[PDB]
């Protein structure tokens, strides 16, 4: 998920501009739901995932808000001590404590029912048990028992009218999430929200801790500790699930890292490029970042240095010259199925080869499979989410930095060979593989483009529509599931706020019993594909002015 917030000093013909592209995969009917609420202290417009009571994306005419996944480390595993005799007990603070348990019956359409037990300790629900060690793992979340309060903080924030009121709500959102703020005066802000544990000294958050007592968290860290910025010196706020601040530790996921190779750089480059940006220019960053190869920038210097003393008739040198001539922006050919330049295909084969010779070689099986992905892997339906730099690729970047990298190289990944020789060997592999499929004339290589699929199954793999309801877009776009833009104090209007969004396929997922599809079932699908957008209405006169229907209810509690 990405976000860019532009303040007074960076905005052109407005005081503040907010562009959000939450990334949750592509689904039919739409992941989010458009809604405006006017009454009981609320006056909002926007869209939100699964029609939650609180709007994750929108504005109230005074302030605007948005979000991106935080990825802080808020979950730790406790290795619970069991006794072989006295079962359903665990040792805690020198006493054998009894576990909470619950039985569950799974009813099955056309099969027998199934029952099982769920166990819980002071630390959390039991994940797995090792009856050979006599160890049970309990998953401990810092937000345990604040789930409901997080929902309500997301609802109450819609009523804030300033930063002061807004942060009182940010302090109650307990999940690891980045929150963003903009207002009619041009003020902009950011908060890395969430509940984080106050760990015992010498607790390594990447690995399990004994749950017998000494390793128990001291409590939770105060909100004064949560990374935050208000009216930053740069004039803008950018995030693409990158680190909030210097020395902030990421999630413990082996596959997740915050290193020198980060896709947020692609946003920063574009925002620093122009002294001021207009709303069209801010919107336009979606199109560029949607199409940008994420590896070009990181390894082009490395490939250039390695092929500098090679001959023009040398195919490994040719491949590097192709990439040098390229801007990294993927464009479809007229055929709607292949890309204009072979760059991504080259980087994909090269990177796979490089990983196999370096990172993969240094790790024991089967842990080696965790580092072999190049990050181009997809299927026929295309990627299921956003494109990122793979973990293996982030680790190889630090290695190619040599001594400029802050990460101590305990094992030399190049295994005593000069870098240039491993790079040229991978380039030979690349050429051998690609030339075999497409021929020798690099100029006529017609490489396959990634596509986009609006899936009928929700993110859990559960049908939320009929299979036939699946939609296909020819061009894969590395962008939000939805995109929304809020412009405060346009110089261009009489209106103090202007907002736009796109909720594809459409607002409604309704299909009548006869097979008659709603009028708003898919009227936003083409708009999505060509980077279009629809106006969001807040005031009564705009809403009235654009009404298509009215329904009045008389209900009493």
């Amino acid at each position: 998920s990405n976000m860019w917030v532009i303040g007074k000093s960076k905005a052109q013909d407005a005081k503040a501009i907010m562009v959000n592209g939450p990334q949750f995969g592509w689904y039919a009917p739409a992941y989010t739901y458009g809604i405006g609420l006017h009454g009981a202290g609320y006056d909002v417009t926007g869209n939100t995932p699964f029609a939650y009571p609180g709007l994750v994306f929108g504005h109230n005419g005074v302030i605007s808000w948005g979000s991106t996944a935080g990825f802080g480390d808020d979950v730790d595993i406790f290795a619970e001590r069991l006794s072989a005799e006295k079962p359903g007990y665990y040792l805690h603070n020198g006493k054998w404590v009894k576990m909470l348990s619950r039985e569950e019956t799974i009813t099955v359409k056309n099969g027998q029912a199934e029952t099982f037990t769920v166990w819980r300790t002071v630390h959390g629900n039991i994940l797995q048990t090792d009856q050979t060690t006599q160890t049970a793992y309990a998953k401990s979340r810092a937000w345990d028992g604040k789930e409901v309060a997080s929902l309500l903080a997301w609802t109450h924030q819609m009523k804030a009218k300033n930063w002061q009121e807004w942060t009182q709500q940010a302090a109650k959102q307990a999940l690891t999430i980045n929150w963003y703020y903009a207002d009619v005066n041009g003020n902009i802000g950011y908060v890395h929200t969430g509940a984080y544990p106050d760990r015992q000294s010498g607790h390594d958050p990447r690995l399990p801790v004994p749950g017998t007592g000494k390793w128990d968290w001291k409590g939770l860290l105060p909100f004064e500790m949560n990374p935050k910025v208000y009216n930053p010196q740069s004039g803008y706020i950018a995030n693409w699930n990158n680190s909030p601040q210097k020395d902030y530790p990421a999630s413990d996921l082996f596959a997740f890292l915050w290193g020198g190779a980060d896709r947020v750089t692609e946003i920063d480059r574009l925002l620093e490029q122009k002294p001021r940006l207009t709303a069209d220019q801010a919107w336009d960053v979606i199109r560029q970042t949607s199409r940008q190869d994420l590896n070009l920038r990181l390894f082009l210097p490395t490939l250039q240095a390695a092929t500098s003393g090679l001959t023009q008739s040398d195919p490994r040198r040719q491949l590097v010259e192709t990439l040098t001539r390229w801007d990294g922006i993927n464009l479809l050919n007229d055929d709607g199925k292949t890309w204009q330049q072979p760059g991504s295909a080259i980087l994909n084969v090269w990177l796979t080869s490089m990983l196999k010779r370096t990172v993969v070689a240094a790790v024991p099986m089967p842990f080696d499979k965790w580092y072999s992905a190049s990050g181009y892997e997809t299927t026929q339906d295309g990627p299921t989410g956003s494109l990122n730099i793979s973990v293996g690729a982030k680790i190889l970047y630090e290695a190619v930095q040599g001594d400029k990298s802050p990460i101590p190289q305990a094992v030399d990944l190049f295994a005593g060979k000069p870098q240039q020789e491993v790079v040229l060997a991978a380039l030979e592999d690349t050429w051998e593989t690609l030339s075999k499929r497409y021929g020798n004339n690099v100029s006529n290589w017609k490489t396959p483009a990634m596509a986009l699929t609006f899936r009928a199954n929700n993110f859990f793999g559960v049908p939320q529509a009929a299979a036939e309801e699946t939609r296909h877009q020819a061009e894969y776009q590395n962008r939000g599931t939805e995109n929304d833009m809020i412009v405060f104090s346009p110089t261009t209007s009489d209106r103090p706020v202007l907002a736009w969004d796109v909720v594809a396929p459409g607002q409604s997922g309704f299909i009548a019993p006869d097979g008659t599809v709603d009028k708003h079932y898919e009227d936003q699908l083409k708009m999505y594909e060509n980077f279009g957008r629809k106006s969001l209405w807040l005031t009564k006169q705009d809403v009235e002015a654009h009404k298509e229907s009215q329904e009045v209810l008389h209900v009493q509690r």
Binding site: A40, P49, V148, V363, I407
Partner: protein
């Protein structure tokens, strides 16, 4: 009036709710959601509570068991029970709104029932505040804030120690899965904090 809920849809079908109190405001929201996205919402309710095998069968038993083992329902009910009446209205308003529309659908299924209920062979049930809360808990708290690989990390670390010896195994672990990397591009500039 206080009993009145006005629902205006725009040129894209986006609903706008005009109401005087909290219960009436969330009732309006609940109602349009049941109009627009009932099958989706229904499937989202079964996904977040682990009740898919009931209507879909054998293939979802493992899924259903995995969902149920990852939460404590009773802990969620206790947080609901502790809400203030204004907070409670949001959740109750919403569930009531939805129910209002589920009653008409279930009353006149020859024209109001979403085609997929017929396809899948089942029908919509009424909602309670717990169901609304579970939609958020299951797709926001478990989707984006429940990430750990600690047991797996330990497995990896153990294999690095068996390969490079104990101190070496540990330094390689720090090269692959570092805690922090001071060169990581950050949202907040270093001058700020």
């Amino acid at each position: 009036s206080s009993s009145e809920i006005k629902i205006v849809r725009d040129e894209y079908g986006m609903p706008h709710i005009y109401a005087n109190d909290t219960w009436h405001l969330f009732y309006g929201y609940g109602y349009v959601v049941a109009q627009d996205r009932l099958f989706q919402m229904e499937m989202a309710r079964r996904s977040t509570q682990g009740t898919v095998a009931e209507v879909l069968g054998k293939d979802f038993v493992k899924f259903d068991k995995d969902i149920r083992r990852n939460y404590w329902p009773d802990a969620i009910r206790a947080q609901i029970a502790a809400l203030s009446p204004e907070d409670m209205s949001i959740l109750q308003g919403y569930a009531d709104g939805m129910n209002a529309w589920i009653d008409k659908v279930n009353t006149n299924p020859e024209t109001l029932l979403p085609k997929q209920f017929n396809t899948f062979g089942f029908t919509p049930k009424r909602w309670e505040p717990f169901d609304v809360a579970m939609i958020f808990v299951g797709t926001m708290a478990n989707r984006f804030s429940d990430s750990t690989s600690e047991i797996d990390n330990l497995a990896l670390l153990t294999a690095l120690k068996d390969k490079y010896g104990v101190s070496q195994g540990m330094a390689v672990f720090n090269q692959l899965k570092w805690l922090v990397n001071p060169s990581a591009p950050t949202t907040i500039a270093v001058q700020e904090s």
